Amino acid sequence: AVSASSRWLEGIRKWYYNAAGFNKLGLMRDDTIHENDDVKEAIRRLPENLYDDRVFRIKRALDLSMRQQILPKEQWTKYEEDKSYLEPYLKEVIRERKEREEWAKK
Amino acid sequence: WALVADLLTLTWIGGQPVEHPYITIGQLASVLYFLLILVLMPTAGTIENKLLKW
Amino acid sequence: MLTRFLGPRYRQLARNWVPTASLWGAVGAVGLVWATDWRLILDWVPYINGKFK
Amino acid sequence: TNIRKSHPLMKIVNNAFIDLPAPSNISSWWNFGSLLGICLILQILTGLFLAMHY
Amino acid sequence: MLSVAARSGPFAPVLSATSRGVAGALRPLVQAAVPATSESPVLDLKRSVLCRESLRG
Amino acid sequence: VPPHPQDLEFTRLPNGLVIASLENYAPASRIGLFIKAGSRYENSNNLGTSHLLRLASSLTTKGASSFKITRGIEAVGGKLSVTSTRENMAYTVECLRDDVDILMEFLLNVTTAPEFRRWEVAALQPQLRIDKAVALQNPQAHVIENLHAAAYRNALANSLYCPDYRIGKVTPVELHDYVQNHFTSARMALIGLGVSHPVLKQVAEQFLNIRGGLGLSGAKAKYHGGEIREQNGDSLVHAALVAESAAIGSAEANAFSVLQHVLGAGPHVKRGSNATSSLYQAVAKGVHQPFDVSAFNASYSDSGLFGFYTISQAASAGDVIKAAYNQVKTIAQGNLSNPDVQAAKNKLKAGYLMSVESSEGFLDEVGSQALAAGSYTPPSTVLQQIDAVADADVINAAKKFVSGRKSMAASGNLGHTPFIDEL
Amino acid sequence: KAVALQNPQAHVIENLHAAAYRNALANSLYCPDYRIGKVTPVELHDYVQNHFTSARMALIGLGVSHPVLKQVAEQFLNIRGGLGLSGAKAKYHGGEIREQNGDSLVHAALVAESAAIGSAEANAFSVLQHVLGAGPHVKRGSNATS
Amino acid sequence: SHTDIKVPDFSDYRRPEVLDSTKSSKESSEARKGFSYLVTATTTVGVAY
Amino acid sequence: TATYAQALQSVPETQVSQLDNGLRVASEQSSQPTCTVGVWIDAGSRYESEKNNGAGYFVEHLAFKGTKNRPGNALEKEVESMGAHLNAYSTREHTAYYIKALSKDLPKAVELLADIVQNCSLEDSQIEKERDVILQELQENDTSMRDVVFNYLHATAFQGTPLAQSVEGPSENVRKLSRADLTEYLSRHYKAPRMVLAAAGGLEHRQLLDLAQKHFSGLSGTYDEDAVPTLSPCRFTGSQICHREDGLPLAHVAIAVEGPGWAHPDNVALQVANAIIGHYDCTYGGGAHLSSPLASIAATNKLCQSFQTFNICYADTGLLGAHFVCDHMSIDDMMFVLQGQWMRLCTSATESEVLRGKNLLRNALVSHLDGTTPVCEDIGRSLLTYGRRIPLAEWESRIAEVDARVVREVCSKYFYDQCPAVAGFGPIEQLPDYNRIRSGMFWLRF
Numbered sequence A: 001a002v003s004a005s006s007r008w009l010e011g012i013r014k015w016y017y018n019a020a021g022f023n024k025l026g027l028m029r030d031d032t033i034h035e036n037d038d039v040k041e042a043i044r045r046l047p048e049n050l051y052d053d054r055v056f057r058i059k060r061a062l063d064l065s066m067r068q069q070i071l072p073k074e075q076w077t078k079y080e081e082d083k084s085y086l087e088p089y090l091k092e093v094i095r096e097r098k099e100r101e102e103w104a105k106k
Numbered sequence B: 001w002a003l004v005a006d007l008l009t010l011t012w013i014g015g016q017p018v019e020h021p022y023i024t025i026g027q028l029a030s031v032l033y034f035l036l037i038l039v040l041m042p043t044a045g046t047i048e049n050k051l052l053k054w
Numbered sequence C: 001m002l003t004r005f006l007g008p009r010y011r012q013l014a015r016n017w018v019p020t021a022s023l024w025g026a027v028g029a030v031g032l033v034w035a036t037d038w039r040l041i042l043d044w045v046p047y048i049n050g051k052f053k
Numbered sequence D: 001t002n003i004r005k006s007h008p009l010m011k012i013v014n015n016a017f018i019d020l021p022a023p024s025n026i027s028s029w030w031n032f033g034s035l036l037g038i039c040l041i042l043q044i045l046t047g048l049f050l051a052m053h054y
Numbered sequence E: 001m002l003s004v005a006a007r008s009g010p011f012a013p014v015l016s017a018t019s020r021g022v023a024g025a026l027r028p029l030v031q032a033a034v035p036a037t038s039e040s041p042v043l044d045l046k047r048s049v050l051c052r053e054s055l056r057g
Numbered sequence F: 001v002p003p004h005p006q007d008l009e010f011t012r013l014p015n016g017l018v019i020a021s022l023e024n025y026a027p028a029s030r031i032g033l034f035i036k037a038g039s040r041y042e043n044s045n046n047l048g049t050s051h052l053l054r055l056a057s058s059l060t061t062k063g064a065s066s067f068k069i070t071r072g073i074e075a076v077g078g079k080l081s082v083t084s085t086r087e088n089m090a091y092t093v094e095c096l097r098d099d100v101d102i103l104m105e106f107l108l109n110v111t112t113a114p115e116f117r118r119w120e121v122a123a124l125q126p127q128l129r130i131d132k133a134v135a136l137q138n139p140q141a142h143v144i145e146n147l148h149a150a151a152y153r154n155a156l157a158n159s160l161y162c163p164d165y166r167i168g169k170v171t172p173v174e175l176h177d178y179v180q181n182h183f184t185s186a187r188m189a190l191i192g193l194g195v196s197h198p199v200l201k202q203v204a205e206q207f208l209n210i211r212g213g214l215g216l217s218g219a220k221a222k223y224h225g226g227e228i229r230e231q232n233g234d235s236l237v238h239a240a241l242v243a244e245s246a247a248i249g250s251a252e253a254n255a256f257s258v259l260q261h262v263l264g265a266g267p268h269v270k271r272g273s274n275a276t277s278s279l280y281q282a283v284a285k286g287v288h289q290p291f292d293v294s295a296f297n298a299s300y301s302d303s304g305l306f307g308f309y310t311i312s313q314a315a316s317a318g319d320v321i322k323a324a325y326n327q328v329k330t331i332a333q334g335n336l337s338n339p340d341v342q343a344a345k346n347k348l349k350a351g352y353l354m355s356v357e358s359s360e361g362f363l364d365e366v367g368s369q370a371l372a373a374g375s376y377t378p379p380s381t382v383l384q385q386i387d388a389v390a391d392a393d394v395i396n397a398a399k400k401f402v403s404g405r406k407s408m409a410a411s412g413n414l415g416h417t418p419f420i421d422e423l
Numbered sequence G: 001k002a003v004a005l006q007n008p009q010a011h012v013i014e015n016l017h018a019a020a021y022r023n024a025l026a027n028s029l030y031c032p033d034y035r036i037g038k039v040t041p042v043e044l045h046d047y048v049q050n051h052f053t054s055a056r057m058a059l060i061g062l063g064v065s066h067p068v069l070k071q072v073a074e075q076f077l078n079i080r081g082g083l084g085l086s087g088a089k090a091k092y093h094g095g096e097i098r099e100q101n102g103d104s105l106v107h108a109a110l111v112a113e114s115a116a117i118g119s120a121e122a123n124a125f126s127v128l129q130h131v132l133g134a135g136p137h138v139k140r141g142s143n144a145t146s
Numbered sequence H: 001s002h003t004d005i006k007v008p009d010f011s012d013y014r015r016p017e018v019l020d021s022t023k024s025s026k027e028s029s030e031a032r033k034g035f036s037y038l039v040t041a042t043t044t045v046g047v048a049y
Numbered sequence I: 001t002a003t004y005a006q007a008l009q010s011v012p013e014t015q016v017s018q019l020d021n022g023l024r025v026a027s028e029q030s031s032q033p034t035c036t037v038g039v040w041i042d043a044g045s046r047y048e049s050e051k052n053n054g055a056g057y058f059v060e061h062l063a064f065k066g067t068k069n070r071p072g073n074a075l076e077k078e079v080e081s082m083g084a085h086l087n088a089y090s091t092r093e094h095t096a097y098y099i100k101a102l103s104k105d106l107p108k109a110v111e112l113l114a115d116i117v118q119n120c121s122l123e124d125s126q127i128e129k130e131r132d133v134i135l136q137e138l139q140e141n142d143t144s145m146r147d148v149v150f151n152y153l154h155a156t157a158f159q160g161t162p163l164a165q166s167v168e169g170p171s172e173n174v175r176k177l178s179r180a181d182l183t184e185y186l187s188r189h190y191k192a193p194r195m196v197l198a199a200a201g202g203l204e205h206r207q208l209l210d211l212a213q214k215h216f217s218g219l220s221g222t223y224d225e226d227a228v229p230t231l232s233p234c235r236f237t238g239s240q241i242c243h244r245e246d247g248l249p250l251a252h253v254a255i256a257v258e259g260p261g262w263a264h265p266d267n268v269a270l271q272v273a274n275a276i277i278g279h280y281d282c283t284y285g286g287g288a289h290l291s292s293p294l295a296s297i298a299a300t301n302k303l304c305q306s307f308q309t310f311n312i313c314y315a316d317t318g319l320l321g322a323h324f325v326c327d328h329m330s331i332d333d334m335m336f337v338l339q340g341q342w343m344r345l346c347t348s349a350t351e352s353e354v355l356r357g358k359n360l361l362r363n364a365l366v367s368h369l370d371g372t373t374p375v376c377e378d379i380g381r382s383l384l385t386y387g388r389r390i391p392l393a394e395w396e397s398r399i400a401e402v403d404a405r406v407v408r409e410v411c412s413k414y415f416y417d418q419c420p421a422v423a424g425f426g427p428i429e430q431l432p433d434y435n436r437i438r439s440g441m442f443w444l445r446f
Ligand code: HEM
Pocket: D040, D043, D044, D045, D047, D048, D050, D051, D054
């Protein structure tokens, strides 16, 4: 259904994504997340392929940050191509903690 | 950077007499110091989360 | 985020520790009164009136 | 085994200043900790030599 | 005269939520103790013997 | 006066699921789901899968988390257990009367909606090593496990416990594949104690209508014979000598069960000389050291193993086995009084009736029956079946042992333990 | 043991002998695991005294003189209070051992009782071996005459 | 053989309230903890002073 | 469909009669084709002196091995032929002899039990054979680290008292107990007011009473007679025994405060509390997710191979606490967590966990009393200790009464600022000093 308002909402989201600039280092959104306990558990649950891809992406970014350089524009992560690979692991970890917290109430 | 420049402003007002423009702007810089930290920076972090669908 | 600590278990744990928290408050208040020789309270304690005049 | 690694005093120096795993990518802005330590020893040494006459 | 393990002989294992692991069969050990010294690994790298959740009021 | 007992209620569904219930008006209830899913249904490519499954019952399901299962059961003071034989898995659940529904829901989620999440599966793999190590501290467990691998080409050859090489290697997909293949309506029996028949029937129709699995009850267990020998130096020799006997539910199985009690199963008296035990007295004549003997009887869907089990001193192993083997030979040769068969029938009949005294023993008996036979047989007809065994049937069963291709397993110091060959 | 048993061939040939023999040639070259930590100083002393004797021994030298070896043998290798010679006698039995592994490749060995070393029959067995085919002769060859 | 392990006589060192083997110690535990904690109480008062 | 509450009422009344003897004869009738029958005696190692100690256990070894009417193996032959099972035990307070038999075999079962309990042969050749059997059982019991720590716990907690003594007695007593020592034990102790004939299963009470009058007549019916002792109370001592043995792969620790007796109403609330701490074993499903904080942390942090709570009851005293089995580097952590749970329950037991403890007890009680054998044992033991059978509905009422306030008062009475008895066996270097165990018995924040 939804057309004109949605693309503008997406436009501000896409604008901010580019201004954030983790994509200039080849980072995905989920690579940049602060490692709390919920997050560390989500990393631990990642499958082999995704875990190893995550590390290479961090390494390549820390390497760039040391040299104070960025990737060629060709190689920046496109907002449309940004895979929220951690989110469903993290969501489930949060859901598990919240159930424990409800049981601890009663 | 608005905090840093607010602090520069406060260091300027610190070093000047308690007289006409300096009083009211010293008050405004003092409000803004506590506004940036207690209110404005924690609102920016929340907006930035919402913007990244997080 | 501190909604976590609201529920019947946490109310019961509050109730269990409250005579202890108030008795510690009693230790602290009498302790501060003793250590400073505090005037307002210690004039009103019927022995320990060793100021007089 | 190294002397540096297991000598009870040199252990502490090793784990703080030699073999300490550090981020590859820490900037200029991370220099200020050592610089604060330098500042403290500078204030100590000059201050003692002032205390000799003050 | 059914049940495979309660025909008494072949091995059953049990895991539980709250209760200790079992292995049971009719192999002998009661009349093996009776002429004596089976100096048994009882609470070596091990478990706990006889059935818990078993107390009176 | 107690209440006059209710009868057992029994229902086969068109899908092949059996439901059985008794209302003994008891403060606690017991629910078992019994499945044709024991270790015999493993092949070469997936050994130990049913071990890891037996250990996976409080892992996360579609309807309840790992945490919920453990806390919800414990809150009502309940139990969840999984009992495996080579043929069956049995998922049992005990709670007070008022709490059946929560325990049912948990039971249904474990058996029909398990998730086998990769990380929960991974965290569980070292439990295989612990559970095996605890079980294998009885020398009897290693002997009976070797005995079956010696006996069978095939299927009953499989260990109850995971092979060491497989620890760490059993996959989420294999667990999912095992449940889909085996936890189906045609391979399943829902047994309840102190619940109504309509409540069980409602559970079975709503939640236990599964089929896309396997056609029934084996690859067929190919008896083979042979020997496995485990040097141990273990102070005592444990030995088991066996032949192919009779499949469960055949009249011949009953002859084997009586033969067992002629020869001698367990002890009846605390610290007794086992006077009416034929094997014990025959060994005791020429062996003056500490020992044990028992008749061994294991009956299955499509095979059986019968013979004897000996614990002895290393040097006495040969003497004990040969004395025991000759005492069976005496019975095969026809030297068996009618009083002996009648005493042995009395021990069988009392032993069975005592075996079904508890809720635990009754439910396992009703569950196994439902899987093996597709019926409930009351105690008085079990007792009638026992009674119908003639002396000649007992002799014939002993004759089949003596002439049958043998299987042997032994652990200990084996320098004086013979080789089938040498018997 | 762990180094040796990383060749699947070592476990197979060790099982092969335990399957074959009642007895003596049945013994492993490598210590049984249950025995690791359990072999005593007295057993080692007992093994040397029983077995490292003049009647059970051969002194072989390459690029030394015969008188120097003969002098060594008479002075230092005159021991006997051991055992009478060359076996308990190895009782062939036959049978099978089967080790599940899942190991990508199956290693199998099938054998019968042949001939004792030094008999003419042993020579027939050795020729039969080369008819049937021992090792390869050509690097990466199709083994045409095997 | 572990059954040969009797605990040796502590009658020499025991408080007089707990010498009787046929008397409950429960009857004197209040008095005995009372005495030793009064010692530590009196000390802390003195040290506070 | 019936409630739990209704189901407890539907459990049939234990019938009790007394013989002119003083011999109590008691039964719970059910539908079952099988029964358990037995004799429960107020006799054990608590009744024995230093010279006597191990006599009851010696009598246990001889009880099944010949009577005046059935000599040698003839009793064995009769029990076996009917498919019956004959068993015995001796605790510190209670001896029992019981038959599992077919219900139709109740007359011969009662007949045989009377013959065992009254007319035991004690043939001098048999006493000599049993001497060597008992000594080997001592050598065996020595290898059981659990049996050893519990003997040590009794031996330190009860020190100068007859409750310090093991059941089986020292090895010197085993080698020098005469026939006359045993005859005197049997004469003094196997008296009709001190013994109960118990049955559960497919029997009428009237039939049991008739057999009691047939076979148990003239134990005491002109005699009873001078010199009895009643049981003297047993002093508890806050104390430690430390059998350091580094050759042993795992440490065993048992720790207990003074329980009250059998009789005392607050055994119920102590058991609620003990259920909350629970038991653990390395073969449980649920590491992290287990309700008990001791069980959860012991599983997560690998503190433990096993632990168990216990409330062992004697007349007017008990052993209340916990036993555990662990690695040498885990003893200090296990003690800290164990004691923290006692302190938590004393000061700040909440309601939800008390309900869990209550439910676990309700389930334990009903699960236990399932079969002719545990019900028979319950009849025999209850009539010795309580004088009545306490019905399942009464236990329910006693469990239901317990809330968080009851848990925290009752725990404080026994645990809070109390001297424990400690027994340690094995690699026990990291076992906390007694002063530091003692300091764990109170909280400075409370
Ligand atoms: C323990 C080492 C120190 C000693 C013994 C010491 C001693 C001295 C003495 C003797 C003076 C008076 C002489 C003078 O005014 O020139 C002085 C003044 C001063 N101290 Fe320190 N000092 C120490 C470290 C510190 C530190 C850590 C600071 C803080 C950065 C500090 C801040 C100053 C300042 C601002 C003055 C006034 C200087 C002036 O304008 O004359 N000093 N101190």
